[PDB]
Design a protein around this ligand. Structure first.
Ligand SMILES: *C(=O)CCc1cn(CC(*)=O)nn1
Lengths: 74, 19, 20
């Protein structure tokens, strides 16, 4: 399925994912498309920050959902 | 400090929007 | 820069309560 990841800078990234993909894996996919190291990514969905070890399904992220990406140096 | 003030303004506007 | 980041997370948290 596909999901969308939006920055505060007006960028939208499309990803191809599985419901069982871990957030860590979603971050790796964002790296593949944007070059952003996973350490610098904070992903946010439905009001919460996402922890690396859980899956998209755990956070109730469905097909065509939109995540939000904020970059943090540390 | 301009960036901080613009971000706080966005936050307040978003909170009003969500209300 | 640190405080800018904290405010950005808050914006994203709030925006994600609309864009989800
Ligand atoms: C990082 O956030 C340090 C605080 C800061 C912000 N600015 C620009 C004004 O917003 N300068 N120092």
């Amino acid at each position: 399925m596909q999901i969308f990841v939006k920055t505060l800078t007006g960028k939208t990234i499309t990803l191809e994912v599985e419901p069982s993909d871990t957030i860590e894996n979603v971050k790796a996919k964002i790296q593949d498309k944007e070059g952003i190291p996973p350490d610098q990514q904070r992903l946010i969905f439905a009001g919460k920050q996402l922890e690396d070890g859980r899956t998209l399904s755990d956070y109730n992220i469905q097909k065509e959902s939109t995540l939000h990406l904020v970059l943090r140096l540390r | 400090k301009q960036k901080i003030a613009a971000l706080k303004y966005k936050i307040a506007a978003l909170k009003q929007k969500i209300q | 820069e640190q405080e800018i980041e904290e405010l950005e997370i808050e914006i994203a948290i709030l925006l994600s309560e609309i864009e989800g």
